[PDB]
Amino acid sequence: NNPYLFRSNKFLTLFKNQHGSLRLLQRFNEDTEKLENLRDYRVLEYCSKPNTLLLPHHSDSDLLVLVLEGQAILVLVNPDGRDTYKLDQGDAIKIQAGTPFYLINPDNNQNLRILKFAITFRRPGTVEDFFLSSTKRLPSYLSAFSKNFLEASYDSPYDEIEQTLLQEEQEGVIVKMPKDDKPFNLRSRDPIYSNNYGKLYEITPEKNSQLRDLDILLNCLQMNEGALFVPHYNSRATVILVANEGRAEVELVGLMQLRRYAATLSEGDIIVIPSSFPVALKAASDLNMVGIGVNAENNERNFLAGHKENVIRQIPRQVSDLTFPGSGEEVEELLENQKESYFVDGQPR
Amino acid sequence: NNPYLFRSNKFLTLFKNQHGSLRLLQRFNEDTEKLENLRDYRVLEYCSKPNTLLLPHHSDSDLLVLVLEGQAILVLVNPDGRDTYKLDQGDAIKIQAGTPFYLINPDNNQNLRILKFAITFRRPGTVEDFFLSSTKRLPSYLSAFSKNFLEASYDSPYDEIEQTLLQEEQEGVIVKMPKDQDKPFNLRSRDPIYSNNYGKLYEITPEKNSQLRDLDILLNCLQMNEGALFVPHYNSRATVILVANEGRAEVELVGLMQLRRYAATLSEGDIIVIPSSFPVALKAASDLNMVGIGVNAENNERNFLAGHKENVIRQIPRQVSDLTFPGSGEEVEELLENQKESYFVDGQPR
Amino acid sequence: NNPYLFRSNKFLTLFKNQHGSLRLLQRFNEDTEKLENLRDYRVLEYCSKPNTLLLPHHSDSDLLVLVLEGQAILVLVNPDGRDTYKLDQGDAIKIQAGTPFYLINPDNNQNLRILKFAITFRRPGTVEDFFLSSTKRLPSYLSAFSKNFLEASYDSPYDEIEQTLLQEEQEGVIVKMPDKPFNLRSRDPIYSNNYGKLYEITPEKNSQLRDLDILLNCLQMNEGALFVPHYNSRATVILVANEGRAEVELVGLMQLRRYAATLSEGDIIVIPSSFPVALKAASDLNMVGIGVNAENNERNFLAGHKENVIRQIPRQVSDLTFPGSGEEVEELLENQKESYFVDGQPR
Missing domain, CATH: 2.60.120.10 (Jelly Rolls)
Structure with a gap:
């Protein structure tokens, strides 16, 4: 009917539980030629409830993160150390591709709603996330490696490595923060x-x-x-x-x-x-x-x-x-x- | 047969009357894989007779304008004021996308022949023009808006707005300039x-x-x-x-x-x-x-x-x-x- | 099965004789959507035996040339003069598109192995080479022009032009040095x-x-x-x-x-x-x-x-x-x- 209109029902639910939701708008050019110019960009919504943590992951894509509602604590992990930011409503920041981050809603009452705007360059139009966490839907990308490589890498027996990194601990990638x-x-x-x-x-x-x-x-x-x-x-x-x-x-x-x-x-x-x-x-x-x-x-x-x-x-x-x-x-x-x-x-x- | 050759008959006539013609070369990649590198560019001819005006419009594309034959008066309108340029044969200028302009052939004998070279970025390969003018082929893009929005916008009854902006005055988007200058x-x-x-x-x-x-x-x-x-x-x-x-x-x-x-x-x-x-x-x-x-x-x-x-x-x-x-x-x-x-x-x- | 893996047999042999070989890796995106990001780039091997010359040509693409094994003498011809470079193993240089060059293996025993990495912009994903040399596989691109244009151009009879430039002298584009x-x-x-x-x-x-x-x-x-x-x-x-x-x-x-x-x-x-x-x-x-x-x-x-x-x-x-x-x-x-x-x- 109207090709420039993307109703909130055109969002795909990537993940959901009683703690929060991650949703992903269909490609701009899925349904029309008229938006070829936008094929490299994707939009995501992250709604999370109070005292939640989004587990550490890195994206293949550059992210423009923008806080629509509530307040958040963003931690970027680099090889060297880590940078911590309080984002208040209206705050935006660019998260470089490859940077591992996690996200916390500290407020004891206020929900968190964040807009991610992904600029894709590896595989144009597609955003991959890499979670360190073994969960129900997906295991740790570390588990993908062979017994040999993991053992050699960490100078540890596989039984230690599995019980310490690779076993399924959490149900989802949004988890409750310690009751504080x-x-x-x-x-x-x-x-x-x-x-x-x-x-x-x-x-x-x-x-x-x-x-x-x-x-x-x-x-x-x-x-x-x-x-x-x-x-x-x-x-x-x-x-x-x-x-x-x-x-x-x-x-x-x-x-x-x-x-x-x-x-x-x-x-x-x-x-x-x-x-x-x-x-x-x-x-x-x-x-x-x-x-x-x-x-x-x-x-x-x-x-x-x-x-x-x-x-x-x-x-x-x-x-x-x-x-x-x-x-x-x-x-x-x-x-x-x-x-x-x-x-x-x-x-x- | 020869894919690098574009005969003058490969131009599409967008508009024509007894005052002038606007023509548009087919996509470079319409007929062959061999010109993928040119798919963002389009070529246009504007031939206009003496004492003609090309009515105000803006393009979605950046234009490189180049005067092959004759002389012209180009006016670029910005929100602030407007800039006026006399173009003589061999003169070129870049018209930013979104800039509303109009074009005059003032010479009382010499035809005007202008080459437009459109660099497309909104919709690659496609040039859209947005004319303010109600004409036979197309009405003003202003007319597209609802009775409510137009009235609220210009703080005027729709009667006034239609009779003043939206009614069709001109036959084409190329019109003759008035006599006695x-x-x-x-x-x-x-x-x-x-x-x-x-x-x-x-x-x-x-x-x-x-x-x-x-x-x-x-x-x-x-x-x-x-x-x-x-x-x-x-x-x-x-x-x-x-x-x-x-x-x-x-x-x-x-x-x-x-x-x-x-x-x-x-x-x-x-x-x-x-x-x-x-x-x-x-x-x-x-x-x-x-x-x-x-x-x-x-x-x-x-x-x-x-x-x-x-x-x-x-x-x-x-x-x-x-x-x-x-x-x-x-x-x-x-x-x-x-x-x-x-x-x-x-x-x-x- | 594994779309990121390109066996050495996935190189296409463009030219070969007893003097050397030129080989060209398939498009990265020939077989999978997962490498759209690489569609502008092509990889080549140039393996040549001792005391060989790669005849003068220009590419439509920018080349990053990288000497894996041996030593080479690269000559870039520009309209003004020419630049000559000795490349040892591990040496790399960018040969801009349109630059005519030739390549020599001077060593009397060591093979030459060069990795060419073409950055394509004219026709994305495609590398054309333009040889001045009439050979068996291909004639000189000069031969393409009409009798009129060639004669007018060099201010000479066609007989002279043909016998001097256009006739097939060499068997291939890799030839033995004196x-x-x-x-x-x-x-x-x-x-x-x-x-x-x-x-x-x-x-x-x-x-x-x-x-x-x-x-x-x-x-x-x-x-x-x-x-x-x-x-x-x-x-x-x-x-x-x-x-x-x-x-x-x-x-x-x-x-x-x-x-x-x-x-x-x-x-x-x-x-x-x-x-x-x-x-x-x-x-x-x-x-x-x-x-x-x-x-x-x-x-x-x-x-x-x-x-x-x-x-x-x-x-x-x-x-x-x-x-x-x-x-x-x-x-x-x-x-x-x-x-x-x-x-x-x-x-």
Whole structure:
């Protein structure tokens, strides 16, 4: 029906128990040619309950980890030592491929919800995880080696090695904790658009060294019920837009023939907004959303309504008069009606 | 039959009326595996008559715009203001994806002929254009939005909005202008890299021009006299899309399992693709000028197999020549010394 | 069965005579989707006997040339002049695409064995060579041009041109004779104990490699030695058995699979990024590694004292991850004293 829309039911449950869930969005190009440009990227949700640990693993892929809800303790293990980070809501960090990490929800009441955005390069489109832990679904990758190699390696009898590393200890890879460069925040900077209806924060690869490497931008969209993000488009960034809280009425325009792709988004729903496609966004409730833009370097946002950054207002009358049915002045007058910019009252009068 | 040849009839007419035409060359990889390296690029012709306007639109693709014939006024609109450029014949400029522009042929007699070279990145191989204009073939992309959103957006009744923006005024996206009235750069802005009595070749490399560095492209303007021959050579890295602009060219291309020769006579509007490392030679049937667009251009080097200057065979020592070739070392060295001129030579039969 | 394994018989013999052979490994992705990441690269052997010449040609591809055995005289022809290089065993150089070169084995007794690693960009996965020489298998690419163009070009009669350039002189492309290169072992080895050395040039350290985003390593091990379980973060390494025989255990993936194999002279195993790998020397062996996606690569070990990531996991977390008590784990990882290379002899 709409190829740019990924309902929260298009997520595959990789793992689940009473402690938390790991879910994996289908390939962007599983169902359509129109997203060949995204085939290298995958999205994952990690919901975990209080006082949980995600057992040590490494990914074959680079991860952009982004805390939507709650607080987390991330530990990266390198051959040398280990780095520990408290991530609060809105914090993001890049976990290099090959780095072994584990994740803790310390809060005694607050759930944890984390968005992983995997950049694949080994096998494009596919994310493999390597867990050290023998569990029910899967054993330790150490167990894959022969009796000889393991014994020679650790200078130990296989019986010691098996009873100490390789036997199945835990049921799952999310377990209960005993009954008891750096990260950066989306909203660490001042919002690039901010009036009485909405804020939009944005970190660009131009401004953050972790993102320059990935050629990604992140933005945090906040709006009030009834507010409208007026028609605009990005020059370069293809933005994967994730409904975090609230419901959003989205209208997307594209193309042969002129097509309109509208949808109402609930918590967990994703729409892909290609570069140069005009888009508008009404808040059905107070909502915040999180955007991940690829091909982000040099991105520029052109508006088609409101006072500020309205490209149509920069078209001279002599040209307007020819382009449009209205006279040059008739057009210029209609564009001056709307006083606010970016975010406006989207309520029927 | 010849997969590197794109006749002028391989262009699809996107739009046409009595004011001008916009045409679009088929994908380079539509008909052969042999051009996978070009699948991200598309070529377009814009021929427009005097005192015409191309209505405001933006592309999803980066455009390299290049004026073959005439003069034009290009206006790039940004959210901040707008930039205006006079393009004369041989002028080129990069139009960023997402930039809304319009194009005017002001000359009261001279036609306008422009080459668009689209670098695609959103949907590889595909160029979409977004026109603000309600026309016969297509309505404004603004019209696509709901009655609610449009009204809320412009703070106006839909009646006003439809009559002012969305109603069809113009018949086409090329319209006649009313009666009673970084920066661009020229191919020939530098000195030609090869220049004798038979031919000139101008060349801008990404090494020398910041707009091209980004695209990893080179442009060259080839001029030759009837009967002149561009002697056998090849590029190391650059795969050149070669556009017959004026005159007719006898072209011999050598390639590969099996050894093949891909020859053809080229007319105004014809294109041949000359892969990297493929030996190529080119005789002028008439006085011709051509335009070259080379991809993978960074660090390109041109090796010749004939003439005095830059003839790689002349750099092979006699001891090795004698083994490589049937002739004695000296017999070879003597034969390569015969041809006195370089690059461009007399191509006339004796 | 094992898609990462390329036996020496999987090389296609492009040309052969009593003077030498040119052989070309099948596409990495011919038979499996699991190596999409390598589809731009091709491997070749050039084995030539003493006092031989490889006739002047240019490639459509960038070549990383690497001398496994013997010594060679490489001549690169540019439009201006020519550069001549003596390569000794272990020497490597990048021959840019389009550069015409020829190759000589001057030694009166030693064979020449060269590993060519082609980086393809024109037609991805395909290497074309363009020989100036008329031979039995193929004529000079000059012969392709018309009588007119050739005559006009060299300002000479076709008779002279044909008898001097275009006629078949030689039987084959290997005939009997009448910036700078760098050695794998030019630096100090990054790992060195009583069982093994590993040399490694990274793109970080060598500007010829920075361009190609490649690392090279020279692995030397003593019979019975074991390269303990490790993985690279980013580099996918094409591993070439040069001398000796190696037991290789490679672990990967929906299902957990082990890809073991015994490798002989000429055999290649591809070791993906993030796949744990271990390697026992059945005999004294040396191998050559070509790692792609090499920029910023990091090697994490799962056994031995130094650079063992499992040792950096704290007890409190270990206790949960593994069946053993925190200290049971900590103690077991302390048993093995040496690092990287260990005694692989069974108790």
